[PDB]
Amino acid sequence: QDLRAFVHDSPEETETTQRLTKLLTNSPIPTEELVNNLPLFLRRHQMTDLLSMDALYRQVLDVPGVIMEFGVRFGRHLGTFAALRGVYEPYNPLRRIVGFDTFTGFPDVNDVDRVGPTAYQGRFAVPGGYPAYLKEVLDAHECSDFFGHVTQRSVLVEGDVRETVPRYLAENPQTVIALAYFDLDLYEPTKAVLEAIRPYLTKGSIVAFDELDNPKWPGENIAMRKVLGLDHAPLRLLPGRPAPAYLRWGD
């Protein structure tokens, strides 16, 4: 296998990324103004991810239910949703944001996922004790929400989605899922979650995938073709971006 056939950063993207890291970490901005100037360090690729999440969220503002992410890593998307929920929904204490991850990286891989060299147990592990920090970040956002006095509006569920997702659902019979964001990369957990969330979607719910047509991670495609079929609903892109691919339930 030629590693260059997989999507990877150009020398230029790496340099931009490194330079911005340096300028953030060695900034002459007074410390208490840094969080007021973050777009200085938010480059095209990452800006694009933010704008995509906003696009997805704007499509479920008239749909009841919660937002769910499978595959959280450091929580980039969860931070986005928490901010976006403040922007769009000050008066919606029921828009719960729920993140699922082992927080210890890939639990185990299936043969179908072994395409490139990063398909191994432990990949994307974040540091020990990470969830408590991420929760602390989320709580910092919620502190100034109109419904900040209501708790469990952000929830991190730690462990294998194959177990945690059905358990979460059993414990929350009130669930409707407005937006389901799949970023697991792996075939087995994707398939299992797709199956479990099905009774809690309504027509109009968004199902989104981070890696559906990526050669390095065919698992999500394989899972989709198995549980539903690629033409079960219309899979769409936000024009100009390879990801996410997303569908509107019932369409």
Annotated binding site for L-glutamate: 183, 210-211, 216-217
Residue nearest to ligand SAH (CB): 71
Return the one option of its own copies, ligand SAH, none that residue 111 interacts with (CB less than 5 to 8 A, by type): none
Q: From residue 85 to residue 104, what is the string marking binding to ligand SAH with x (rule CB under 6 A)?
A: ---------------xxx--
Q: Where are the alpha helices (DSSP H) in the chain?
A: 11-25, 44-58, 76-88, 130-142, 161-171, 187-197, 219-227
Q: From residue 159 to residue 198, what is the string marking binding to ligand SAH with x (rule CB under 6 A)?
A: -xxx--------------------xxxx--x---------
What does the alpha-carbon distance between residue 24 and residue 102 come to, in Å, rounded to a whole number?
29
What does the alpha-carbon distance between residue 146 and residue 92 come to, in Å, rounded to a whole number?
9
Look at residue 141 and give its three-state secondary structure: helix
Return the one option of its own copies, ligand SAH, none that residue 38 interacts with (CB less than 5 to 8 A, by type): its own copies
Q: Is 76 in the site for ligand SAH (CB under 6 A)?
A: yes
Subset of residues 102 to 121 that bind ligand SAH, contact rule: CB under 6 A: 102, 105-107
CB closer to ligand SAH, 77 vs 85: 77
What does the alpha-carbon distance between residue 114 and residue 14 come to, in Å, rounded to a whole number?
25
Look at residue 135 and give its three-state secondary structure: helix
Q: How many CA atoms lie within 13 A of 75 on its CB side?
A: 24
- Of the residues 72, 134, 197, 222, which one makes contact with ligand SAH according to CB under 6 A: 72
